[PDB]
């Protein structure tokens, strides 16, 4: 037929070429990712010193899960594990184009296949010389903290003792009622209640002869962007690029999250101690220990706690 037809990467490939293309595409991922492993030796942009009021870039990480953790005081803290995975700087804007006072950096993590993606996204990455990433996000960065595109970022970018903010899409609950969506009391089970147990009561008053905008009603619950503020970093695993963040993080396991320094008033200028542009392992000024801990943390393999 002289009409539109559908195609996908595998339609015309033979049995042998099916394996060959798979190995080739994975081969390219290897070479491209090892080209960018050395930022400081590839014309790094000038590195300005830290000044008060600076905001540096953040990372995109995958949610591994939760585990228990203890402090030297014996308290148990439930902690979430975030893995920084194929995180690169992707695009830079200046203050003018972003229209904010501050500039913008777009980061991206969790490389994905190239086979079911629009041509537009693939061209964007081919210019940058990176395999495609699962998600983009935007970070507000001051001019001193700008980092050149194509620069990888690592869990060591964060250090134990700093507080952080995580934003991710919450678990979806589908279309829900009014009791489970907004915690409405509902109506009694017995004593004459007829076909009204979990229903909303009166919508509004009789006078206004309408329903106010923003009235809470049954609808689709979850799958929204939410942020958690002021989560402490208890430990960083440099070998696997794992960050231990106090408490709960929005989203399901294997959900990508946005990690950046906390914007709460208390920790206004705490990034003085942290690597200001970012943590460069290519610099190799000093080789980090595999596990970084916060001082209060009780490390395993230590003597059992005796509150003498």
Partner 1 sequence: ISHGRVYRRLGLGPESRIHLLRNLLTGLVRHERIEATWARADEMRGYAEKLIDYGKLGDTNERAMRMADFWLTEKDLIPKLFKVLAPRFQGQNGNYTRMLQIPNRKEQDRAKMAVIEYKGNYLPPLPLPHRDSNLTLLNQLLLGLQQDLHHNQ
Partner 2 sequence: AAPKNRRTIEVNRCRRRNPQKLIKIKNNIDICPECGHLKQKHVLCGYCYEKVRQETTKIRQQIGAQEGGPFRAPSVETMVLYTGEKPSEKDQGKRIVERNIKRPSWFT
Question: Would you tell me which residues interact with partner 1 (CB under 8 A)?
Answer: 12-18, 20-21, 24, 171, 173-174
Q: Residue 89 forms beta bridges with which residues? A: 107
Instruction: Output DSSP code: residue 206.
Output: S
With CA atoms as reference, report the closest residue to 89 among 157, 156, 149, 139: 149
Residue closer to partner 2 (CB basis): 15 or 284: 15
Residue closer to partner 1 (CB basis): 18 or 305: 18
Pair type for strands 152-153 and 133-141: unpaired
For 16, 115, 154, 172, 245, the CA distances from 85, given in Å and listed in that order, are 32, 20, 8, 24, 16
**Token pair in block for residue 14:** 């033979």
Contacting partner 2 within 7-26 (CB under 8 A):
11
Positive/negative CA dihedral, 255, 78, 298, 165: positive
Q: Is 194 in the site for partner 2 (CB under 8 A)?
A: no
Q: Residue 80 forms beta bridges with which residues? A: 66, 245
Contacting Mg ion within 161-220 (CB under 5 A):
174, 186, 209
Q: Is 192 in the site for RNA (CB under 7 A)?
A: yes
Residue closer to partner 2 (CB basis): 12 or 76: 12
Q: Residue 175 forms beta bridges with which residues? A: 220
Applying CB under 7 A, which of residues 12, 185, 284, 303 lies at the interface with RNA? 185
The stretch among 58-66, 69-77, 178-186, 260-268 that binds RNA (CB under 7 A) is: 178-186
**Where is 28: in which H helix or E strand?**
helix 15-35
- CB of residue 66 to partner 1, shortest distance in Å: 17
Q: Is 208 in the site for RNA (CB under 7 A)?
A: yes
- Residues in contact with RNA by the rule CB under 7 A: 175, 179-180, 184-196, 199-212, 216-219
- Residues in contact with partner 2 by the rule CB under 8 A: 1, 3-6, 11
């Amino acid at each position: 037929l002289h009409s539109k037809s559908s195609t996908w990467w595998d339609e015309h490939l033979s049995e042998e070429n099916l394996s060959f293309v798979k190995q080739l595409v994975s081969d390219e991922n290897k070479t491209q990712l090892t080209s960018k492993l050395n930022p400081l030796k590839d014309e790094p942009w000038p590195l300005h010193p830290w000044e008060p009021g600076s905001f540096r870039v953040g990372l995109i990480a995958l949610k591994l899960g939760m585990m228990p953790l203890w402090t030297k005081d014996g308290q148990k803290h439930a902690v979430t594990l975030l893995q920084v995975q194929d995180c690169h700087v992707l695009k830079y804007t200046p203050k003018e184009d972003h229209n904010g006072k501050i500039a913008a950096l777009t980061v991206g993590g969790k490389t994905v296949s190239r086979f079911y993606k629009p041509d537009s996204r693939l061209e964007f990455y081919r210019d940058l010389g990176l395999p495609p990433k699962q998600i983009h996000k935007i970070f507000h960065v001051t001019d001193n903290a700008v980092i050149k595109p194509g620069t990888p970022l690592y869990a060591a970018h964060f250090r134990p003792g700093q507080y952080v903010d995580v934003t991710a899409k919450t678990i979806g609950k589908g279309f829900q009622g009014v009791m489970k969506r907004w915690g409405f009391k509902g109506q009694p089970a017995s004593h004459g209640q007829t076909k009204t147990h979990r229903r909303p009561g009166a919508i509004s008053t009789g006078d206004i002869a309408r329903v106010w905008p923003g009235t809470k009603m049954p609808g689709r619950m979850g799958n929204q962007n939410r942020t958690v503020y002021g989560l402490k970093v208890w430990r960083v695993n440099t070998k696997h690029n794992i960050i231990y963040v106090n408490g709960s993080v929005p989203g399901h396991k294997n959900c990508l999250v946005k990690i950046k320094d906390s914007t709460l008033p208390a920790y206004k200028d705490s990034c003085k101690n942290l690597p200001f542009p970012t943590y460069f392992p290519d610099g190799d000024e000093e080789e980090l220990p595999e596990d970084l801990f916060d001082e209060s943390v009780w490390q395993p393999s230590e003597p059992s706690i005796t509150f003498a």
